[PDB]
């Protein structure tokens, strides 16, 4: 034993677990482009060329992706940006008129994907109003009930709620993200490349924030992703539990390649005073229809690399694929945003066939919305006005969501199908390396010190 | 590390260094905690909500030194001595092994007691200061 | 009360109190001026209302002490002699009985005089910070 | 200008006196910077804007000074040799010619690196916080 | 022509209304500085100082 006395250390680094209301920073000089942007602030404007960072030797932290209190506070950041943005934008009510449609016939020839509307809508004055048309491109308007004619369609917006129009200044795009923890807090980082999604995490790191997490909506599979370091991961909160969702890494992209041939032309409806209304009016080219295209030779590899790694935690089962089960046209579908167009491709390839991972172009038709049930599920209604000519995509494909079908198979099968619906998890693929603890600086802990003794001044131990 | 010029993020390397390799560049994180790196929107009411928490934290921690008289001090002394059930009265040989973030776990029930002490040793000081010696 | 710990509602029993038996636990009340028990809607914005408030009548309190040279201290004799217009010069006699609560009452109209003095006793010394004598 | 009480404007036109002059009366800077002058509409939101900034200006400035080993004096000596790089080795002939708002062009750049060695001041005194005189 | 100039009315932006009496002013942020010399000398194992 020794003599020894207190002593206060205020300055100590020494981190508690906690949950904060996170700033966000944006990469560049994209806060000058960002005030004109919604899945971005008005503006996430930095102050220093983040992200440095550090790494803490011996230490060693608990981490937990599926508890994380970032993802929570992500989500209800950008649904909430998503209301503010979308607010002041003109407002749908003064459609839902009783649509008399027929068929949309085109140069020598008729599109099959959509129906030439016509119906009364009012000028500048109330009193008066005016016959007008407009192509909506999609089938998916409610034939009006209540009658035999099966001329005559409406809106799906006002049997549920009315919609509000996305403006066209505002741009839809995934900007890449940071965020930045207050003062009083620092941002964990897991260096560990083989982290499976929850459990120590032995080579640890702080940063100012978080790199460059951009914001992009999709279902079944996820787009213009971070990839794997080493090699393909697969997290999961408990594989044996059938539910939950088995999120996957890839370890290089499969780029998709894909488009919207036609080449439509916007109209400018006037529904109300300083009120505009933006609809497809015309084509003024050849009709193919979307489509996308995914490398058969790169995707097909895909499947083999990732159908051993799940076989390894289940052993001596050859692992299947399969279309999805059911749901809404957002999930059943993989559904994504670009260039202003909400696509919904039916995965006419990315399902098919055994694949035991012991080794022993495919075309998807994608239909198209304008009203969108927004991929958070249940609320907002918004109509994407139309995009003037063609649109093209080229994203890396990064990461599949799946889901299993249990529980009395055949003991040598089991049978995986896509999954989605849900925003957090495209996002808790991405945001999952990190955490936020408080710096708590620590005070008592003995020393050989002494006491003060009548006041003199000391200051050597 | 030792060293002062330094980065916030050049210093807490010493997270799971020794508590003596620890207690020197202890002046960083006390320069850190105060502002760091921080129409109306979401980010725009969080930088509300998040700086005056910063301060609010900031606030609390020195208004503890303010009263046990270690005011402006980064290490210091106090005169209460170290009752044994709180630790074994041989940290001057361990703390060469443990680093601060191990330290912490083994005070943590008994830290809000230990603050008592140091307020009462300020009133040590406090009951001496009406009586006598302070006529000068 | 004597004591130090207690409760913020542990100690204020003093308000009645003698003005010595008052100058002892005075730690209570400065640790409680900071914290206390503190979609958008009232209480939202009150919490950023009356939450800055706290701070900042807090700090003006901390900077008279920092400029008087009494930083720090709960307890701090100055260099200003008693004017016996303020108040008679046996109070000595007197703060057996009075409370702090009515002592104000008497110094009320003096007391923004008064840091006047307390700011020339402080600039004795700024006079005496500058030039030759410290050679130490 | 001789005589501290005063105003905030009735010092500050030491800004164009000698620069020796304008260490007296150094307070009232001191007590300004703290709060000042200061259905919700624009004024209301600003109260919060502007107050928030103001008080955090003020916690960066006072822990310089607590870390420097300044804490709570307006006039500081520091352990530190003044390099004949940052400016010639006579500003005590000069100081009755310049006046502080002409002194600040000369050490623009060289601020931040002295501030530096102000820390390493310290830490002569952080290295002096281990070693052996805290058994007196 | 050389020895002819000619002026008329302007307006339109009210920004130039309140210029022509928000002119005299400036916003300056107080900054106590860096550092100065002096002629004083290393403390000596924390001892407190009058004058220097």
Redesign the interface.
Known sequence: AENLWVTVYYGVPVWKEAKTTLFCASDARAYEKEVHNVWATHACVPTDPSPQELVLGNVTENFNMWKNDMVDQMHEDIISLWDQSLKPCVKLTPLCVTLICSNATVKNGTVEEMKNCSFNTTTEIRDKEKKEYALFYKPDIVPLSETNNTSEYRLINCNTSACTQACPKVTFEPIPIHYCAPAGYAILKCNDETFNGTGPCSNVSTVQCTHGIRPVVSTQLLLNGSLAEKEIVIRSENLTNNAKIIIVHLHTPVEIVCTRPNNNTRKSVRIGPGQTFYATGDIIGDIKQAHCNISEEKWNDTLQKVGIELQKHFPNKTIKYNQSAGGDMEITTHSFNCGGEFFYCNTSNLFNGTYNGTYITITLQCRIKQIINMWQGVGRCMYAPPIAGNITCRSNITGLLLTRDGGTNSNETETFRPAGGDMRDNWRSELYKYKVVKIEPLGVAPTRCKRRVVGRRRRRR | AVG??A?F?????????T??A???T??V???????????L???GI????????????????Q??????????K?????????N?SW???????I?DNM???Q??KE?SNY?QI??????????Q???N??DLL?LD
């Open positions: 002062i010029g980065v993020l050049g210093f807490l390397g010493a997270a799971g260094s508590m003596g620890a207690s020197m202890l002046t994180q006390a320069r850190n905690l105060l502002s760091g790196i921080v129409k929107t979401v980010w969080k930088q509300l909500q998040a700086r005056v928490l910063a301060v609010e934290r900031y606030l609390r921690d208004q503890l030194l303010g009263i046990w008289g270690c005011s402006g980064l290490i210091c002394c106090t005169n209460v001595p170290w044994s630790s074994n009265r041989n940290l001057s040989e703390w680093t601060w973030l330290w912490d005070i830290t230990i603050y008592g002490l140091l307020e009462e040793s300020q009133n000081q406090e009951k200061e009406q302070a």
